[PDB]
Amino acid sequence: MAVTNVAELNALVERVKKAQREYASFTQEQVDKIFRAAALAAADARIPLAKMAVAESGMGIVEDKVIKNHFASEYIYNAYKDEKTCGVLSEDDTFGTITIAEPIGIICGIVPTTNPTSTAIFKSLISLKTRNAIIFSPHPRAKDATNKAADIVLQAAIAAGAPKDLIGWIDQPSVELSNALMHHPDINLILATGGPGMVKAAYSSGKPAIGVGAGNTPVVIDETADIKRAVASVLMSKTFDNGVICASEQSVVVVDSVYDAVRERFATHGGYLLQGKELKAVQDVILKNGALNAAIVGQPAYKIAELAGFSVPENTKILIGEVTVVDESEPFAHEKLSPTLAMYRAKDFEDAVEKAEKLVAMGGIGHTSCLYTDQDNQPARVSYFGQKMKTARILINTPASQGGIGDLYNFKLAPSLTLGCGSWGGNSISENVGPKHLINKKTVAKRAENMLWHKLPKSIYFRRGSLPIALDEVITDGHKRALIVTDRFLFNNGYADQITSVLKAAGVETEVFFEVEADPTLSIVRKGAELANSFKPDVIIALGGGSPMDAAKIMWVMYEHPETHFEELALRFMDIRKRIYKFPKMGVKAKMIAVTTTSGTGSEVTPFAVVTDDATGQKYPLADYALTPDMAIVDANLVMDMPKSLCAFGGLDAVTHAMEAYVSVLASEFSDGQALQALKLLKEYLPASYHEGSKNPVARERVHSAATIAGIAFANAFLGVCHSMAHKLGSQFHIPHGLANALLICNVIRYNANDNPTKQTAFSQYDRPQARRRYAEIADHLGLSAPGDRTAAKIEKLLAWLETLKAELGIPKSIREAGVQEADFLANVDKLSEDAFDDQCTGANPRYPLISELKQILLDTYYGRDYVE
Amino acid sequence: MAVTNVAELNALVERVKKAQREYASFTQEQVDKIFRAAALAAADARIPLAKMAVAESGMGIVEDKVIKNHFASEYIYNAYKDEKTCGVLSEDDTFGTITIAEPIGIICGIVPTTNPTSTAIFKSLISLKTRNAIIFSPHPRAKDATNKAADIVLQAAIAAGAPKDLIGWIDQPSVELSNALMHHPDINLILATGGPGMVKAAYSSGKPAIGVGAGNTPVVIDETADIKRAVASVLMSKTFDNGVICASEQSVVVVDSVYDAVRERFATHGGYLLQGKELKAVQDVILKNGALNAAIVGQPAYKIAELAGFSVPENTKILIGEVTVVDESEPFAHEKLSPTLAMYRAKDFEDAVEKAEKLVAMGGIGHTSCLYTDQDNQPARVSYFGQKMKTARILINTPASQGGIGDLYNFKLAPSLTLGCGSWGGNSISENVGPKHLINKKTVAKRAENMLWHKLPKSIYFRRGSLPIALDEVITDGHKRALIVTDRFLFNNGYADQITSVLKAAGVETEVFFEVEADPTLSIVRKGAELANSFKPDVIIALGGGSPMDAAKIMWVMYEHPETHFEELALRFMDIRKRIYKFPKMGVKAKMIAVTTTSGTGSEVTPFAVVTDDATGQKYPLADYALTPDMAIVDANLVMDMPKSLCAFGGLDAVTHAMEAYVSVLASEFSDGQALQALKLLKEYLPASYHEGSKNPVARERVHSAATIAGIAFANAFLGVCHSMAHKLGSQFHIPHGLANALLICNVIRYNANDNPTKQTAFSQYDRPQARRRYAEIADHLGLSAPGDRTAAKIEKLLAWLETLKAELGIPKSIREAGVQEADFLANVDKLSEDAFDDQCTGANPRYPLISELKQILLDTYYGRDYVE
Ligand SMILES: NC(=O)c1ccc[n+]([C@@H]2O[C@H](COP(=O)([O-])OP(=O)(O)OC[C@H]3O[C@@H](n4cnc5c(N)ncnc54)[C@H](O)[C@@H]3O)[C@@H](O)[C@H]2O)c1
Ligand SMILES: NC(=O)c1ccc[n+]([C@@H]2O[C@H](COP(=O)([O-])OP(=O)(O)OC[C@H]3O[C@@H](n4cnc5c(N)ncnc54)[C@H](O)[C@@H]3O)[C@@H](O)[C@H]2O)c1
Ligand SMILES: NC(=O)c1ccc[n+]([C@@H]2O[C@H](COP(=O)([O-])OP(=O)(O)OC[C@H]3O[C@@H](n4cnc5c(N)ncnc54)[C@H](O)[C@@H]3O)[C@@H](O)[C@H]2O)c1
Ligand SMILES: NC(=O)c1ccc[n+]([C@@H]2O[C@H](COP(=O)([O-])OP(=O)(O)OC[C@H]3O[C@@H](n4cnc5c(N)ncnc54)[C@H](O)[C@@H]3O)[C@@H](O)[C@H]2O)c1
Ligand SMILES: [Fe+3]
Ligand SMILES: [Fe+3]
């Protein structure tokens, strides 16, 4: 039963550990009942413990401890009784979160002599609500009391449905014993108290800790304060337990304006101002051996002077010494737990808090500070006192001894002894301790599918003869200044009068910018914003496709936000809503209506805008749904006179826009029927549009509509990896986009079409690799294989249809065959296989390629081979 | 610039410390901008660091680190960018709370080799948002990378409005150096990572810590799971960085129902089942010297077998060994950071989680666990997996490697590396680390006045001839069974037919209980509830006063809640809403209409109900507003035949009911005008009612109304200390209440009437002692002293009026004169001076008496003296 040896300890802990494991399986009602019985047993025993605390400690006063043994039970209960601390605290079912709050284990309670019983009723009683255990290592001066404070708690818990040794205490303490308890393995936490050396040794143990320092507690009394209650509260805080209590106001800092008044008001109401010889004698007994006399602590005032060598009335509550030094040389400013007090003299407020912060900074860093002022009309002072004072508790118009243990003067403050002083003091709690610190929360995280979107430009218009019907719809009914962006071949050949012809004839002012060439550079973009910033357009228009529709919707940026650094605008990301350079909201200065005369790109719908740096020459595909065209237009009358090449490269980038959008990882049921309806039109009408041309406008139109439909697909289901390398392959060699996508898709399919790949994209919605299947759902949709095929022929037949399609469009079989030299390829292939993996298009490819696996399907194309793996 | 010495460290830290102090004074915009620049600089450098991390670490794979260096910047930013962490977080102005969130200081970042760069971009970047600093102590294998990961962060912050050495790193690390950094004083925290030994030495330093262990991560696959994604996600988690990443699924636990299926599905998709000789050879290289081979970590699978002595395809993602042992003897179950994996065989779910909990309990206690099942239709399994598994993260249908660092598969989970494992593991964080852990919150607590009340029984009726008018008002219009409580003198003398006369004549069933005598005991109460529980009344009535009206409203308790233990019902409290035994809501079975024939008590309004234990004989005044009479009645026709004594003792307890209610600490402006209007009527009409009696019914009525008015006062403004001793003085000697209150009030006034008292009640509303003034506002209200008196004569004149009043009512001058013997007083005076301080009435007396100060004004009354102090 008794504990004065190191083995008795190692036995106790075990018969305790085994209580917890039996106590942890308890419910809320089975412990809500243990919590009351232990709190009553502690309240009804408020007087005796307070007697047993003075007989043994030699300090304190009875009637002021009784407020503590009682506060530590009633004011603890009213607060932590309804705190759900057993199981599920919260359950957000929209998400998949649940907080379950298992306990922590067992604890070591390091008790002081200052508050031996309250600090025990407080920990004992709070460690039962969290379904924990605890073991006390008390102070020799108060071992009999704080251990009689737990038996009065335990013997009332076991009587309420608890085990019989859940709690434990050391009877004959030491260092060899505590240091053997704090370092015990079956312990799981340390709940300490007692100032420096204590916390310096709690954390240093090896276990966690909620140790708690302590020290000075400056209090400031400004001109705009109620010097009456400022003083009573100063005395009601020192004399309370004779200041032995922590946080008590060891030092006031008054401003000259009201010093004399305060000086007297302290005198009349039991204040002896240490004027001369008395003072020195008093600041000589305080500090013994660099520390405060361990015999003066908690003792009444008149009992101070006797040790000093003088005498004062027995009714004196306090001993005040008017001083100026605010450093360590003055022992009259350290953490004297006596009723003594230091009275400083300051010019104004700012001069005080500068002085307070200086003497909290010496012994009481982080603990608490106080202020007395107009709590309602001087909120800036407050704001200036909280932002300047490095204390975890700033107590405005409250006494510290009864506001730091806070449920009396202020609510919303966690009632507690064991007041955290923040890392400033050497403890990482920063708050009044409670049961939510003795607790191991834990979070079950159900798989949540990542949110998706089908976002387009409103006002898509599509048929032959749709320009004037559209401009005169939403543009002219509205804006007044336009900026048509296009290329020369369209400005020269009357593709841009057909649009000004309509704006003119109404009130509008046009200005065309036609210095855009294939693969636009950032130099052309600036030059376009440099113009937009002069013409100040109310709207922006973009013709052709790709180069214009990619230079314009970015010129739309530099016009509304010229501070945009392309280096940050083209930063590769991992998710498009968790973007690190969130695009600015740009639809205010001007809109970005878009027209297209080129089939494939589909840029008229999608956020993508491919441009190159003009310094490194790397195409930086940059993406955000803020640069959607805002009323795209797609008229098939601007395509019927296209050459045979641009038709192929276009309609053949659209194929690889849907192919790697039906198979992508962001694919959905919204973007999977459009991709197919595109891929089914590019099969019935694409060859015709190449051979026949304008002679079959029915086909030249569908292809134009399809290539846009893919946009609806790959605007939401981003591209795959064929573009991540086609952008680089089409830059280091100036190969066109569509021609590059054609020389890879018949070797990229068979890359992604492995159900046992080396990697995978880590997308929640992506259960497992479906690409091999997601590619056969294509063939069966086109009509390649009806009868019961292996799912591997449906692919061979998909490729075959491509090699057949790439044949009857003049597409070469390889790059070598496309105007590239093995000497210039092998050299800068490792460079653009890395710069491909670092593209934003590849973050959606189902297989998450390895640099060592793009290089291979990048050589196998130069030599017209097949990636076999 | 460089750091390979212990002094270079002590210099670095200083030029860092001085950055913080300059960085702490920064605003939100001045740091919201530092946070971006550092996150971009880290994202754009996602590839190289991943290269620099493999060249130097020898482990990992490039394309999987890049997801980390990028997650640690983008997914960190999107989450902690809007987190207010600079100043005021919250401001509840109704209360007086403000959370200001000063920073913590500077930090030591202990980095592993597993995640050298991400763990640096994560800490570096999160320590800038909290306006902190940090210093890294990296792993020798990865010193060049994680230090190149901070310069890429710092040099981008200083370029955004920051100092030039805010961050720091060690180039040539050691133990002598870290151990000298962790123990450095100017440090304020430790942000560690690296498993056991690390955290065992972080906390052991002397500073706080958020160190983070690590270990096994069981994953359970039940019958009702999607074995397809269960597997892909198992591989997508191991092969990811080659399992080197923490939290990865080191062990699966499948149930027989689907084991064979899972066994194959693992095989087809890159799973080599270690069947025979291969297995042993494989579980022989894992653990070297009791620990795992530090060369196998992060290495690919096929590179495992080579060390084992066999070979497998290069495309194998994983190495699986079907085993049964679940203890330490099997090294195939420890925290192997390799792509290896253990496959266990279980009968059913419960048999698995019992097995998982056993192998998390060995090396990975607290870190995280996983489960694959129907996340929607099997919520009990979930509930059973979270309540049973001691892990801070339970991952349902998510892969661990990409769900523990959680913003991808589940949201609402704090994205973080540095995953806390809870005290189970040896760290008191219990949660994924973030910036709110690197932060010192602090709470300004403005003085809030404690809420008060003016709560009475509705339906107070008062005039001559008010019984029948009242009973036939709300009782008969309603209830049907009554229980009149009274004493014999009223039952005998027809005071109780006057009330049944009216109930009868209507449909009601009466039963009278008249075994109540003065100073009722708990035996009489039970005997009354023992009756009420038989008659089952719909209403309760109480006549006379005190004894009945105090035994009935408690018999009202035992009737509606017979489980009430008087020991808890009479427990002294510190506040009446923070009560530790909250009374039950008792107005459902029966009401408690009350009548009174005795003036003083005023119990017909107030919650008080004085009764004695009958064992110790101590009057336990118990109080709660739940036992208010619910339609009190006060008719003056039941008093006009009272004797001369009861008139005095009554009207003279009412005096001390208002006197110590206008001066009390809970006094308010609601209860201060009633107290006076009582105290002004007991002065004009009390003497008359004594001498004349029924001959002056005008006076006999007012006194009856006044004595009730005081009830309105001291029901809300509790009594003082005259009752806390009159209850004991009237019990140890059976002196009547009013006679005791009269022999003390003319010595208690001059007790509370000291403006420099020894103590004070600690009530916020009580600025300072006003009693000396609050007693003179009385005299001036009665008419004792009009002309400009000293405020000390107004008291002498108040007392004089009392000694004069106590004279013309036959009240003796002292107790000695009242039938008490010095031999029996001096003996049991120390006993009832303590049992007075332990009364609930004294908790409202302005002076908070000392036991040594009640004894004195308790002897000074025996000898008819004056308390002088
Ligand atoms: N912040 C609070 O809530 C609070 C409450 C009470 C007291 N205090 C502070 O406590 C201090 C006074 O308490 P004291 O009078 O107990 O001084 P103290 O705490 O030095 O007394 C020593 C206590 O700490 C233990 N202790 C000391 N050094 C130790 C070590 N190296 N290893 C293990 N245990 C060790 C002893 O066993 C004993 O319990 C004052 O500074 C006061 O402000 C603070
Ligand atoms: N997601 C996207 O939005 C996305 C994806 C990939 C590539 N791109 C961009 O698309 C570009 C492709 O360029 P494109 O194929 O869009 O058009 P393009 O701008 O390459 O035009 C190429 C040539 O075709 C000419 N041309 C355009 N329309 C014509 C017409 N109707 N009649 C005759 N000649 C015409 C142009 O004048 C130019 O000389 C790529 O280079 C890249 O910048 C965008
Ligand atoms: N939970 C997480 O956030 C997380 C993430 C990744 C890895 N991990 C864990 O980290 C560990 C990785 O292995 P490691 O690379 O940590 O090897 P290791 O465990 O030897 O780490 C040693 C580290 O300890 C540091 N150190 C400083 N003072 C020390 C002292 N007094 N004693 C010992 N070490 C001291 C060294 O500088 C070195 O960096 C594994 O346990 C892994 O699970 C955890
Ligand atoms: N809850 C409160 O409001 C409150 C406050 C202070 C004290 N008290 C308690 O009230 C009790 C006092 O009871 P009381 O003194 O009010 O009366 P009492 O209950 O002592 O009994 C008074 C006696 O006087 C006689 N009596 C009563 N009414 C009479 C009448 N109308 N005519 C003739 N004789 C009559 C009866 O014999 C009766 O027993 C004490 O226990 C005291 O502690 C209550
Ligand atoms: Fe394309
Ligand atoms: Fe009374």
Numbering used by the authors:
A (entry chain B), B (entry chain A): 1 to 869
Quote the study that presented this structure, word for word.
Incubation with NAD+ and Fe2+ is sufficient to extend the filaments. Clear density for NAD+ and Fe2+ could be observed in the density map in the AlDH and ADH domains in both subunits of the AdhE dimer. The AdhE helical assembly can be described as one AdhE dimer repeated along a right-handed helix with a helical twist of 164.5 Å and a rise of 56.4 Å. In the extended AdhE filament, three different inter-domain interfaces are formed. The dimer is maintained through an AlDH–AlDH interface (named (α-AlDH)n/(β-AlDH)n interface) and two symmetric AlDH–ADH interfaces (named (α-AlDH)n/(β-ADH)n and (α-ADH)n/(β-AlDH)n interfaces). By superimposing these structures with AdhE, we could observe that the interfaces present in dimers of monofunctional enzymes correspond to the ADH–ADH and AlDH–AlDH interfaces of the extended spirosomes. Remarkably, the substrate/product channels of both the AlDH and ADH domains lead to the two cavities located at the AlDH–ADH interfaces within the AdhE dimer. The loops 2 and 3 seal this cavity by mediating the interactions between the AlDH and ADH domains. This allows a direct channeling between the AlDH and ADH domain active sites. Therefore, only extended filaments are bound to cofactors and are able to catalyze the two-step reaction of conversion of acetyl-CoA to ethanol.
Intriguingly, AdhE is capable of oligomerization and forms a filament (identified as spirosome in early studies).
